[PDB]
């Protein structure tokens with residue numbers, strides 16, 4: 001089985017890697033083997049003196065703290081966002097733009113960006129007076145928790161994969177990781193897209209035809225939208241993968257609606273299993289959220305993302321076709 005897994009891992013540089021098949025072949029360790037594969041591909045172990053046994057130990061511990069009984073926000077989703085971010089980092093319009101520390105931060109942020117997700121939304125945790133909403137004062141409750149867990153696990157035995165970074169380097173990475181994961185809060189999507197459009201309008205390139213980023217504000221803004229695009233990348237994948245992600249998020253939404261109904265609360269959108277329209281929700285999800293975001297990203301890295309945008313529009317056309 002080790003040979004079959006190594007064959008599938010050869011697609012790690014490709015959009016639409018079959019991450020579910022990799023989860024099978026790796027014994028439900030997609031996050032660990034995909035992160036390890038990416039770290040070798042980018043030669044991140046030698047650059048930052050990361051001991052290989054420290055890396056595997058942390059990745060296994062981080063993967064354990066993703067809930068296996070949550071349908072969508074599990075370790076497969078984490079591995080999917082890591083691998084999608086890895087491909088977006090390699091796009092020609094961004095060649096040699098980001099340093100090795102920014103690359104490490106963006107990939108590490110993707111790996112921890114949903115750790116210990118309980119399968120319910122921020123608003124549910126706020127409305128139900130949960131301990132998490134109490135700890136974090138109703139502000140980016142899940143995203144603050146993911147960061148806290150992801151950093152604390154570095155202190156477990158033989159788990160500090162940043163042990164050989166300089167104190168300056170650790171200081172810069174920690175701030176960049178926090179800025180990125182906090183930007184995955186869906187309540188910040190509109191402001192994140194609005195700033196991304198302003199950058200597309202005022203786009204500037206270098207003499208090598210490569211995106212020019214002068215300052216931390218523009219650089220972290222591109223990294224924020226990149227991980228945000230990978231988080232919202234399910235409808236841009238081949239349909240057989242997209243549909244599996246749709247089935248998983250609808251199961252998670254339906255389970256929250258059952259808890260909302262059992263508590264006497266008003267059911268959140270798309271969460272009532274007795275009056276849900278999966279196809280129309282997917283169409284509205286693409287039209288109002290996913291396509292505006294990816295169309296803007298495609299303008300930023302034009303024409304590198306045209307095939308991804310083509311697949312998204314074909315999938316939107318298909319989900320529409322099932323309605324009549």
Ligand SMILES: CC(C)=C[C@@H]1C[C@](C)(CCO)Oc2c1c(=O)n(C)c1ncccc21
Pocket residue numbers: 186231232234235245246249281282285
């Ligand atoms: C809460 C809102 C507004 C969006 C969420 C964002 C989320 C959780 C991002 C991944 O962490 O994924 C999807 C969402 C959603 O509403 N739908 C319909 C989806 N359909 C198919 C696949 C993923 C999603």
Ligand SMILES: [Mg+2]
Pocket residue numbers: 113114142184185
């Ligand atoms: Mg999240």
Ligand SMILES: [Zn+2]
Pocket residue numbers: 077081113114184231
């Ligand atoms: Zn996510």
